[PDB]
Amino acid sequence: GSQPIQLSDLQSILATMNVPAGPAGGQQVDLASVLTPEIMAPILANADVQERLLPYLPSGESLPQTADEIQNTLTSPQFQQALGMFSAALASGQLGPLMCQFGLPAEAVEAANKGDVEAFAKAMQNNAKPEQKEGDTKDKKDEEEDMSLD
Numbered sequence: 001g002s003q004p005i006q007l008s009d010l011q012s013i014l015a016t017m018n019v020p021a022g023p024a025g026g027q028q029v030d031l032a033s034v035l036t037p038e039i040m041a042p043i044l045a046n047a048d049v050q051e052r053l054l055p056y057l058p059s060g061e062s063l064p065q066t067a068d069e070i071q072n073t074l075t076s077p078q079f080q081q082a083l084g085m086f087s088a089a090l091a092s093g094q095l096g097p098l099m100c101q102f103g104l105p106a107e108a109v110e111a112a113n114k115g116d117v118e119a120f121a122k123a124m125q126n127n128a129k130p131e132q133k134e135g136d137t138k139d140k141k142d143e144e145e146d147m148s149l150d
Helices: 008-015 037-044 047-056 067-073 077-093 097-101 106-114 117-128
Strands: none
Touching: 037 047, 037 067, 037 077, 047 077, 047 097, 067 077, 077 117, 097 106, 106 117
């Protein structure tokens, strides 16, 4: 014959199906590792979110009333406490439309509406640092198998 070699073997692979992706393990993420006081200050300085942080006022009772406060504490007990409370407030209460009332970033409202801090982290991460390099290396390869005559 023409020696096609079994055939059936390369047919068995065509019985494969497309399986969905797994969530892996979504739960929490440290926002303070990417969200700096420079980002959180203008947002937490809004009365809209402050009002929602009232039932979650950080240790000390007196929460950062202005952006200068948050930008001063940097990553001190005040910031880490406020970060946690803010994360809880948006997750349970869901700020959603409140974020758009002050004209805050879309990344914030998307996450705050769902109450998902992971989506917020990813959005902020990629917003600040975009992934761009490109390295396909394809096309114009071919084989020229038949080409063997001179």
